[PDB]
Swiss-Prot record:
This is Laccase. Highly thermostable. Optimum temperature is 45 degrees Celsius for SGZ oxidation. Optimum temperature is 75 degrees Celsius with ABTS as substrate. One of its GO terms (biological process) is sporulation resulting in formation of a cellular spore. Changing E489D: 9-fold decrease in catalytic efficiency with ABTS as substrate. 26-fold decrease in catalytic efficiency with 2,6-DMP as substrate.
Length: 502
């Protein structure tokens, strides 16, 4: 149905501070119901948005800028998407919110803990709530971060509703690299959605072929949207100048993984991963992008003046990709006149490369089944509410060995830290399931170049052990690690992570 490439790509405006001095920058962001048209041929869609915008405003900060954001809830008391009351037990408000700055090196009470939620005007607050005004010291590498809702049992719904936005940390020490900047540095927040004829968002209230005993609504274990949006617009086009652009590619989708290419066979240059600039730039013809991953890339349109180039997708969601729909992301049109000379660069040398092993943690990804027969996905056999087990000591380095005996990939995220990827190694799934015994079926494989820098969300593929290494700090406190497939996260593939200080 919806005609591709008829609406221009929105570029969210950069948020202006309410107050700013040399010592402190203070922002206010209020979650509001709002209405926006997502495609030329759709009626406007009721959404929830940060400052009533979808996506939310892009926040731009400097490394070490002392930033505060008062994230406020001015949402209705009843949700518009289907709440499953059976997935969590503790009366509480139906609509609960909390903002997680994904990738932030953030004090624990500003990290957006799932039980630090709040209702409208903070009238009711969860048992881990401490503060209204979140503090982001930004003492971390320049990078693409993003912010999104993280409320207990509601994350998949609140994010789907529209509560996502970009947050960019600029390190002045990188300015000398002359990477494309300003108008030539564009975030691309990719979100798949299913939209009804009347313009309303569709989110399933049950899996296919439910029983009458099955809760209604019921959580589903995965969501694949019919349409692809970039920056809140269905299959948009972007007019570009014939020169180099930097794009901050963010997968803000609930479940869907992308595998991106350019339909002319042209290359990307990757310059950065979740945790900042790679040590060296990486020429790529394609890349996978699972939920919450970011690729910081340069696309050089210099030789392509007048051309239309599709950012294409080869990964299916619930089936093979459809050439007419989800195989398309957006269309670049190289038809904008040059505003000035391209004085940007695509340097090879970007940053220095990524220490004692304190602990090695072996962690399994697996599910159980509930009383209604639905899968409940768990991190190392535990529910969210079980006593904490992942308890690294502050200032120490650990290796985490993530065993995935399930049928699909899980994008695992650690809060607070970024980590290095050591290797992946295939193992005998049936043996592991039958006995707990890990028997490798092949040699360990080091990460691709794209994963030789710093990561915070990482694909743990089926039938493999993935090893990562992280140094836990600089802060101690109560954080989280989770699978970022939101349908998994909410039931119940998330755990507390305590970074302890003796
Ligand atoms: Cu996240
Ligand atoms: Cu998962």
């Amino acid at each position: 149905t919806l005609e591709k490439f008829v609406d221009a790509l929105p570029i969210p405006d950069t948020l202006k501070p309410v107050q700013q001095s040399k010592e402190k920058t203070y922002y206010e962001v209020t979650m509001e119901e709002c209405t926006h048209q997502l495609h030329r041929d759709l009626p406007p869609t009721r959404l929830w948005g940060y400052n009533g915008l979808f996506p939310g405003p892009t926040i731009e900060v400097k490394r070490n800028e002392n930033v505060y954001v008062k994230w406020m809830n001015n949402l209705p008391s009843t949700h518009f998407l289907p709440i499953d009351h059976t997935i969590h037990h503790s009366e509480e408000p139906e609509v609960k919110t909390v903002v997680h700055l994904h990738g932030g090196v953030t004090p624990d009470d500003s990290d957006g803990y799932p039980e630090a939620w709040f209702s409208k005007d903070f009238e009711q607050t969860g048992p881990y709530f401490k503060r209204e005004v979140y503090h982001y010291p930004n003492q971390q590498r320049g990078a693409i971060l993003w912010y999104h809702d993280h409320a207990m049992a509601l994350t998949r719904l609140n994010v789907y509703a529209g509560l996502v936005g970009a947050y960019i940390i600029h390190d002045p020490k990188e300015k000398r690299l002359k990477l494309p900047s300003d108008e030539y540095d564009v975030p691309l927040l990719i979100t798949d959605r299913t939209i009804n004829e009347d313009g309303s968002l569709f989110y399933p209230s049950a899996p296919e072929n439910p029983s009458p005993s099955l809760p209604n609504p019921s959580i589903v274990p995965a969501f694949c949207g019919e349409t692809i949006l970039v920056n809140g617009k269905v299959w948009p086009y972007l007019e570009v100048e014939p020169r180099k652009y930097r794009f901050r590619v963010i997968n803000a989708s609930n479940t869907r993984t992308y595998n991106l290419s350019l339909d002319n066979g042209g290359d990307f240059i990757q310059i950065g991963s979740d945790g900042g600039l790679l040590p060296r730039s990486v020429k790529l013809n394609s890349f996978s992008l699972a939920p919450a991953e970011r690729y910081d890339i340069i696309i050089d349109f210099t030789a392509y003046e007048g051309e239309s180039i599709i950012l294409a997708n080869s990964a299916g969601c619930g089936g093979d990709v459809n050439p007419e729909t989800d195989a398309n992301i957006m269309q670049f049109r190289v038809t904008k006149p040059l505003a000035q000379k391209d004085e940007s660069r695509k340097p090879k040398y970007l940053a220095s490369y990524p220490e004692r092993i304190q602990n090695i943690r072996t962690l399994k990804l697996a599910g159980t089944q509930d009383e209604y027969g639905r899968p409940v996905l768990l991190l190392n056999n535990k529910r969210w509410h079980d006593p904490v087990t992942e308890t690294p000591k502050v200032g120490t380095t650990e290796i985490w060995s993530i065993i995935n005996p399930t049928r699909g990939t899980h994008p695992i995220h650690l809060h607070l830290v970024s980590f290095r990827v050591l290797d992946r190694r295939p193992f005998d799934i049936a043996r592991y399931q039958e006995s707990g015994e890990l028997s490798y079926t092949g040699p360990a494989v080091p990460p691709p170049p794209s994963e030789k820098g710093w990561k915070d969300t990482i694909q743990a593929h089926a039938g493999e052990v993935l090893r990562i290494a992280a140094t836990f700090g600089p802060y101690s406190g109560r954080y989280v690690w989770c699978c970022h497939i939101l349908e998994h996260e909410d039931y119940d593939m998330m755990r507390p992570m305590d970074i302890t200080d003796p």
